[PDB]
Design a binder for this molecule. Structure first.
Ligand SMILES: Nc1nc2c(ncn2[C@@H]2O[C@H](COP(=O)(O)OP(=O)(O)OP(=O)(O)O)[C@@H](O)[C@H]2O)c(=O)[nH]1
Ligand SMILES: Nc1nc2c(ncn2[C@@H]2O[C@H](COP(=O)(O)OP(=O)(O)O)[C@@H](O)[C@H]2O)c(=O)[nH]1
Ligand SMILES: [Mg+2]
Lengths: 110, 430, 463, 29, 439, 100
């Protein structure tokens, strides 16, 4: 003698069952000065999210000799100007971020 | 939200209705007091499907209950759960039917039908989008069989677009309930294939023999038989009233169940069916349900569904369950017994699902049957009509209120036509 | 080759035929009767509560000097019927405003149902409580009958609203607090009605009650009326003035008489008389509270009851104001009748701090072994010190007893698992000993032995 | 008053003859 | 600057869309509640959310989606689901009456009074976008409202925007396992509508997915919920190349000029790999060579039509992850050498490859296990001729005696339409068999 | 004290409540939704209401009244002086109240 009540949509993702007594109160102060609207993007900033800090390849830095790149791009006549300059970029950016503080889940978003 | 209305006449039609609301009331959490006491919040998102609103917080079901004598209806609300029906919705005369169509259709039937039409229109126009009509009445009785057809003809003309279903109890040859059953019964069946859209007979014979071979209760009462039927309807409108995956409204069944205009008779049954003693020891799993649904005896129609082949059928599986096994079981059954299914219409089994099983069970199925075997009763009903009319027995009262021999030949005329026109598809080969 | 339905049949006790199946249904009905009681819904139990609280006797306060003064208790007796007013807090009238019907009772034995209390309705120049002829007085039922104050009032005649049988002015106990509850007294003999005003009311002297909204005398009559309390009649508002017309204007024109002096007799039906007094288990009760609490929160009902209580009190002294305990039970809404609350309060009257223990009860030594054992696993994983933040993170939502069956979503159980733990600050410290009791209650109401043991084993990874 | 003959309104059946013609012609090509 | 517009109509569509959004939702780092958890600032020189999302001014994002259906139960279901606060409140255009599996009811009587609303909504949404790349349409063809609204919307869409491309993902009935009985009728009328207005469409017949789920995933009791994510993943891979860095980019424009020999032959089938659960994954190879080989396995094809009964026209397979490019040539060279896969005489090269760098992301609580190499192979081949062949046969036999004909004619559709529709397939089937002849 | 709430504003705000409830749903409704607020968040089910949640509710319905007005309205809304309301009486004044 029950009714259950778990719809096919429900079992997949979730059910809210929330908004306790004071919960609505808290959100009231949030909208006090919250104004709905937007400006236009400042342009020259919309662009694809970069993946690797090198050109035409993904900078996979690891111990493994088959995925070092560095251990893989020394066959040239000399010390390839590309990997070394790329590395310092990752290090220097971290220090500058620490000066400001971003921790954007990775140095890439910065 | 595609609400519908219920119109039932005659005590037989009255009895079925009484159980239906109570069972329907429980599923949507309506107590005899009517104050909502549900647990989950899914029990109100479609309360409008079968209930209106009122001041004070009480839900008044939308039903039309009326009969040609006061005694029966004085009892329907006499017991519990009867207080829900609004008094304004009751209409009752003071004459009586007496198991004759003439009195309840032309002389007395006509003199009171006007009031009923007034009541129905008020509610019917109330909804936002009418979704259909469902009528419970008895073709072997006086008030029901006769009054129902006249109301059915009257309503359909005014609303040529909506759909209509029918639940009637054709009389069984083995056990009798009235001697004038053949006359009024046959004269009534001819008046459905012309106006009504869907017909799904129910046989009291199957009710008795089902109770004693599967349920195994010695003393069964009329309470037991009604409960089974009440569930039968409860599954038809299940998808229309709850969420799910593949919803199928009342109309959706028609386009998939009726292949030709004059072939809209169905037979229904309920599964699973298990007695108290066997309450627990069986495995409520998909394979068990599929086998007993098509069983020879589990069906509720006096006809044997293995004496011909099926044209089309659909299943309304209720309650959470896997989808893959549902299709495969349907696929397997359509194969292992091909000879029992018509050949020129491929994939002749429908599927449908809902996300809420009935209270008190984990899996539920409501089958709909459009079988060539349905003609077997018509031979039994028609054949008796011939001999009885041979000697003009009991006829001179039928002619007593303007009812004349013209249509008696005509009315029986179509019944033979329907039976023969129903059989030629059995032997039809592409 | 067993053949059923064998003509003449015995009872299920015998084994003649078809006994395998029908035997159960006798058990099933016995099986079902067990569940009906489990929730307090059997028509047997409530009826007594209807009968008990209604049939409780009352004591009438004596009358000093036969003078009716506000505060005493009087029995309203119908002179024509030789009966008294009766109240029913069960039968309900139909309207937007909730109200109760009233009737007269033949039996003259004072009881709670028939106790009416008088008070001062509106301020007046009068100082002393000596009631005055033609002044406003209001009638209210005893507090014991209903928690909310109850009053009797009426309204003018309408086709929509009419007396159930009398067809006259209708009267019902309601919650109105304005004009409709006012009343005043009139003399019987018309010779002294107008001179009446200014004389003390004498207890037991015949009194006529008039209704300010309509100036319609309340009176009883002889008509059928049926309800649970045996047989009684109806009480309506209507003034039975004599039919014969009395010429006002012609007398009015010459000026012989005045409007104030009445000029028509009244039959005996309007008579009424005020009457004064003739002369000047704990073991079972605690069961209901735990049982009633069970439905509203299932297995974990008890904690929240304690959880709810901790909010009202502040000082932790455990002595909360006795009245202030009454609402808390109401604020949780279990089907626990007001009639039952006072028994608990009077039983321990000097007390929840002592009260809580008795609900905990005594556990079987088997259960304690598993409760303490679980903590051993947690301490090893969490190390020397245990912090609440460890517990919540330690909780394993995935399996649970109800997640597997899909009764509820993990976010449900995970949040629910949290509230019962009270209002402790997250950075407090709790030892294993305290952890012992916290799960003692959980087993307090989870009767099923198997289910309770299921909670511990899977929940905390205890092997 | 009996109407069950199905040995053959005739306008539709003639169309079915035309309908099949194109599909054969497409099939032939 | 570059954005795509989503179109969904039909229980098969409305729900599949209900899934395809979660996969995107989790990948880009926006939680279901609608607020990104900050910690992603610092000039954010990557508009990774534009390809599917649009800025609301401060915080949340409103996805470019239009939800349509003639029934309230499904559409309003999402209104109070876990995604209540994400979709625009008024963007869920919902009807009032069920289609009832009568295509005529969905294309000439009821759909008209709401289609205007649909085209209205598409107008306002599009204006905000500046570089609209094209359209994505998911619809259920073997249903009443699905085909009706889809065919009708497709018609009106072409008459307003023109050269803008549109990719259609239809779900036709399975060979032997299907629900609807009148489905062969209503679906047949669909081909006429979408044969001359949609450039690219992918067969995704249901029956195949069950086999793929059972054969590899080792799950014997699937439900519709688990079927979708496999379909949803294909969307995730197909549209990734726009919104991620890559060594060899692939744009949506390189399908209307890269995988369809002629304007008429524009039907192709899909597939996916690897398909491994969370238990059996780590103990396999999953190298570049292995992943490709399973791609052409016949039984794994998402369409229940053995590709071994025909030739191949052109297949574009997109790589996402960390595939070493020179490994890509390793697989293709061997595949051409084998004999069981045969190509038509006139097409020397029929593969156009791409390489992404963002790994596939697995929705929590699912079946697919975390991996590091994957491929989404699509193929337009003469094999698909069987699927049209099979559906037609089921059609003509039942139409012989006008089964179920009344429900359609009585609603306004001309009785002669069926004559032409079957003529539509006849030409299309005739067209296919002609191309396969060697020159 | 800065000031005492005048009877007008208590009347004025109460005006902003009653009228707007009609705004949602249909005319006959706004009372079933009224029982929704209690029903759609309460473990108690006692039908009793607390001052805070009365603030929480009326904050919900786009009437950003303040705390001080709440104390005056709640004080006048209940007469027993206990600051607790039962929903048989509360709704009765909200809608089926012939005078303002
Ligand atoms: N694989 C898969 N197929 C689905 C799903 N939902 C519906 N379908 C397909 O849709 C067909 C029937 O149409 P539906 O999608 O149910 O609904 P419809 O086509 O819009 O027609 P209506 O239901 O009247 O609105 C079925 O044969 C299924 O094959 C789903 O969730 N998964
Ligand atoms: N199985 C079953 N049949 C019923 C029930 N109530 C009535 N009937 C049928 O109703 C028939 C008698 O109806 P009748 O009085 O002639 O209808 P009327 O002529 O319209 O008044 C009988 O044949 C019964 O079979 C019931 O509860 N169960
Ligand atoms: Mg649909």
């Amino acid at each position: 003698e029950k009714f259950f009540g778990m719809t096919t949509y429900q079992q997949s993702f979730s059910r809210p069952l929330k908004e306790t007594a004071h919960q609505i109160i808290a959100q009231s102060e949030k909208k006090i000065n919250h104004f709905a609207g937007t400006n236009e993007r400042p342009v020259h900033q919309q662009s694809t999210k970069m993946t690797s800090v090198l050109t035409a390849e993904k900078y996979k830095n690891e111990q493994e000799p088959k995925d070092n790149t560095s251990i893989q791009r020394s066959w040239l006549p000399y010390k390839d100007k590309a990997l070394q300059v790329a590395e310092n970029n990752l290090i220097k950016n971290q220090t500058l971020n620490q000066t400001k503080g971003f921790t954007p889940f990775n140095p890439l978003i910065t | 939200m595609r609400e519908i209305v219920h119109i039932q006449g005659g005590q037989c039609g009255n009895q079925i209705g009484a159980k239906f609301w109570e069972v329907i009331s429980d599923e949507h959490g309506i107590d005899p007091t009517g104050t909502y006491h549900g647990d989950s919040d899914l029990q109100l998102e479609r309360i409008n499907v079968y209930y209106n609103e009122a001041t004070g917080g009480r839900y008044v079901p939308r039903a039309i209950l009326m009969d040609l004598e006061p005694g029966t209806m004085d009892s329907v609300r006499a017991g519990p759960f009867g207080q829900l029906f609004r008094p304004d919705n009751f209409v009752f005369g003071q004459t009586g039917a007496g198991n004759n169509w003439a009195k309840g259709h032309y002389t007395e039937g006509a003199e009171l039908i006007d009031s009923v039409l007034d009541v129905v229109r008020k509610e019917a126009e109330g909804c936002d989008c009418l979704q259909g009509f469902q009528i419970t009445h008895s073709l072997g009785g006086g008030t029901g069989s006769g009054m129902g057809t006249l109301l059915i003809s009257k309503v359909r003309e005014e609303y040529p677009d909506r759909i209509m279903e029918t639940f009637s109890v054709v009389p069984s040859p083995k056990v009798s309930d009235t001697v004038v059953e053949p006359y009024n019964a046959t004269l009534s069946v001819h008046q459905l294939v012309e106006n009504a859209d869907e017909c799904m007979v129910i046989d009291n014979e199957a009710l008795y023999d089902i109770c004693f071979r599967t349920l195994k209760l010695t003393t069964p009462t009329y309470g037991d038989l009604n409960h089974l039927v009440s569930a039968a309807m409860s599954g038809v409108t299940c998808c229309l009233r709850f969420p799910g995956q593949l919803n199928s409204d009342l109309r959706k069944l028609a386009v998939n169940l009726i292949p030709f205009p004059r072939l809209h008779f169905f037979m229904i049954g309920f599964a699973p069916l298990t007695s108290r003693g066997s309450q627990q020891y069986r495995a409520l799993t998909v394979p068990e349900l599929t086998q007993q649904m098509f069983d020879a005896k589990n069906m509720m129609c006096a006809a044997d569904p293995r004496h011909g082949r099926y044209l089309t059928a659909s299943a309304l599986f209720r309650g959470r369950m896997s989808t893959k096994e549902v299709d495969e079981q349907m696929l397997n059954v359509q194969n292992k017994n091909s000879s029992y299914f018509v050949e020129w219409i491929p994939n002749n089994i429908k599927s449908s699902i809902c996300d809420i099983p009935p209270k008190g069970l984990k899996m539920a199925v409501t089958f709909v049957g459009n079988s060539t075997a349905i003609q077997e009763m018509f031979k039994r009903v028609a054949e008796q009509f011939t001999a009885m009319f041979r000697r003009k027995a009991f006829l001179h009262w039928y002619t007593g209120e303007g009812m004349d021999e013209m249509e008696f030949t005509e009315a029986e005329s179509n019944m033979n036509d329907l039976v023969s026109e129903y059989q030629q598809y059995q032997d039809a080969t592409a | 080759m067993h053949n059923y339905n064998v003509d003449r049949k015995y009872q299920y006790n015998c084994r003649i035929g078809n006994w395998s199946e029908e035997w159960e249904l006798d058990e099933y009905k016995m099986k079902e009767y067990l569940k009906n009681k489990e929730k307090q819904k059997l028509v047997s139990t409530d009826k007594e509560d209807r009968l008990k609280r209604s049939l409780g006797g009352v004591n009438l306060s004596y009358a000093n000097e036969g003078l009716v003064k506000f505060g005493y208790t009087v029995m309203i007796e119908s002179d024509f019927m030789n009966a008294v007013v009766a109240s029913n807090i069960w039968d309900k009238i139909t309207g937007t405003e909730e109200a109760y019907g009233v009737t007269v009772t033949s039996q003259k034995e004072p009881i709670v149902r028939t106790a009416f209390q008088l008070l001062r309705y509106e301020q007046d120049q009068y100082q002393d409580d000596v009631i005055h002829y033609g002044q406003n007085f209001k009638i209210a039922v005893i507090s014991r009958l209903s928690e909310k104050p109850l009053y009797l009032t009426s309204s003018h005649i309408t086709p929509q609203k009419c007396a159930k049988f009398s067809r006259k002015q209708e009267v019902s106990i309601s919650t109105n607090e304005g004009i409709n509850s006012a009343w005043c007294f009139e003399y019987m003999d018309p010779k002294l009605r107008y001179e009446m005003k200014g004389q003390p009311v004498r207890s037991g002297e015949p009194v006529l009650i008039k209704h300010i909204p309509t100036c319609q005398w309340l009176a009883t009559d002889n008509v059928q009326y049926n309800n649970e309390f045996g047989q009684e009649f109806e009480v309506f508002c209507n003034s039975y003035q004599c039919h014969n017309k009395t010429q006002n204007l012609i007398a009015e024109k010459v000026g012989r008489k005045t409007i104030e002096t009445p000029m028509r007799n009244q039959t005996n039906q309007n008579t009424f008389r005020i009457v004064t007094a003739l002369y000047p288990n704990k073991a079972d009760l605690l069961n209901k509270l735990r049982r009633a609490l069970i439905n509203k929160n299932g297995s974990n009902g008890l904690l929240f009851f304690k959880n709810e209580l901790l909010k009202q009190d502040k000082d932790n002294s455990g002595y909360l104001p006795q009245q202030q305990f009454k609402q808390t039970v109401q604020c949780h809404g279990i089907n626990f009748s007001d009639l039952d609350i006072k028994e608990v309060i009077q039983s321990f009257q000097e007390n929840y701090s002592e009260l809580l223990i008795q609900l905990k009860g005594t556990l079987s030594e088997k259960r304690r072994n598993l409760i303490n054992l679980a903590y051993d696993v947690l301490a090893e994983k969490l190390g020397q010190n245990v912090t609440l933040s460890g517990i919540f993170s330690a909780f394993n939502k995935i399996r649970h007893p109800d997640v597997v069956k899909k009764y509820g979503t993990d976010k449900e159980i995970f949040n629910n698992f949290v509230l019962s733990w009270g209002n402790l600050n997250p950075h407090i410290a709790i030892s294993r000993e305290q952890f012992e009791s916290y799960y003692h209650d959980f087993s307090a109401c989870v009767d099923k032995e198997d289910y309770f043991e299921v909670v511990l084993k899977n929940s905390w990874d205890i092997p | 008053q009996t109407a069950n003959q199905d040995i053959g309104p005739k306008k539709t059946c003639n169309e079915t003859n035309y309908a099949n013609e194109y599909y054969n012609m497409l099939r032939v090509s | 600057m570059r954005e795509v517009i989503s179109i969904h109509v039909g229980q098969g569509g409305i729900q599949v869309g209900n899934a395809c959004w979660e996969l995107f939702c989790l990948e880009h780092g926006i939680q279901p509640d609608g607020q990104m958890p900050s910690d992603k600032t610092i000039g954010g020189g990557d508009d990774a959310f534009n390809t599917f999302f649009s800025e609301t001014g401060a915080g949340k994002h409103v996805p470019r989606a239009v939800f349509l259906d003639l029934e309230p139960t499904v559409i309003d279901e999402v209104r109070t689901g876990t995604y209540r606060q994400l979709f625009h409140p008024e963007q869920l255009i919902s009807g009032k009456e069920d289609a009832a599996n009568n295509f005529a009811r969905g294309h000439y009587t009821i759909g008209k009074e709401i289609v205007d609303l649909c085209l209205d909504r598409i107008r306002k949404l599009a204006d905000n976008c500046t570089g609209l790349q094209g359209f994505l349409v998911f619809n259920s063809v073997g249903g009443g409202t699905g085909s009706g609204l889809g065919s009708l919307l497709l018609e009106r869409l072409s008459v307003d925007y023109g050269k803008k491309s549109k990719l259609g993902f239809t779900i036709y009935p399975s060979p032997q396992v299907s629900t609807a009985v009148v489905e062969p009728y209503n679906s047949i009328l669909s081909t006429h509508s979408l044969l001359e207005h949609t450039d690219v469409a992918v067969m995704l017949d249901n029956e195949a997915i069950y086999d793929i789920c059972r054969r590899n995933l080792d799950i014997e009791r699937p439900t519709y919920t688990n079927l979708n994510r496999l379909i949803a993943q294909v969307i995730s891979s197909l549209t990734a190349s726009l919104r991620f860095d890559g060594a060899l980019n692939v744009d949506i424009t390189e399908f209307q000029t890269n995988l369809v020999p002629y304007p008429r032959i524009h039907f192709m089938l899909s597939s996916y790999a690897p398909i491994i659960s969370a238990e059996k994954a780590y103990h396999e190879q999953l190298s570049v060579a292995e992943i490709t080989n399973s791609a052409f396995e016949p039984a794994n094809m998402m369409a229940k039509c053995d590709p071994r009964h025909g030739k191949y026209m052109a297949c574009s397979m997109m790589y996402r992850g960390d595939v070493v490019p020179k490994d890509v040539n390793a697989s293709i060279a061997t595949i051409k050498t084998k004999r069981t896969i045969q190509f038509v005489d006139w097409c020397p090269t029929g593969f156009k490859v791409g390489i992404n760098y963002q790994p596939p992301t697995v929705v929590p609580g699912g079946d697919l296990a975390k991996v590091m190499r994957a491929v989404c192979m699509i193929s337009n081949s003469t094999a698909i001729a069987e699927v049209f062949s099979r559906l037609d046969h089921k059609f003509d036999l039942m139409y012989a005696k006008r089964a179920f004909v009344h429900w359609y004619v009585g609603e306004g559709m001309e009785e002669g339409e069926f004559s032409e529709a079957r003529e539509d397939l006849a030409a299309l089937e005739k067209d296919y068999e002609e191309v396969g002849i060697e020159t | 004290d800065d000031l005492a709430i005048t009877k007008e504003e208590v009347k004025g705000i109460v005006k902003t409540i009653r009228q707007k409830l009609i705004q949602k749903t249909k005319g006959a409704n706004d009372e079933f939704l009224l029982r929704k607020l209690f029903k759609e968040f309460d473990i108690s089910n006692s039908g009793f209401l607390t001052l805070d949640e009365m603030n929480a509710m009326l904050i919900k319905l786009e009437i950003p009244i303040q705390k001080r007005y709440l104390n005056a309205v709640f004080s006048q809304l209940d007469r027993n002086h206990s600051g607790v309301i039962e929903f048989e009486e509360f709704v009765y004044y909200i809608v089926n109240d012939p005078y303002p």
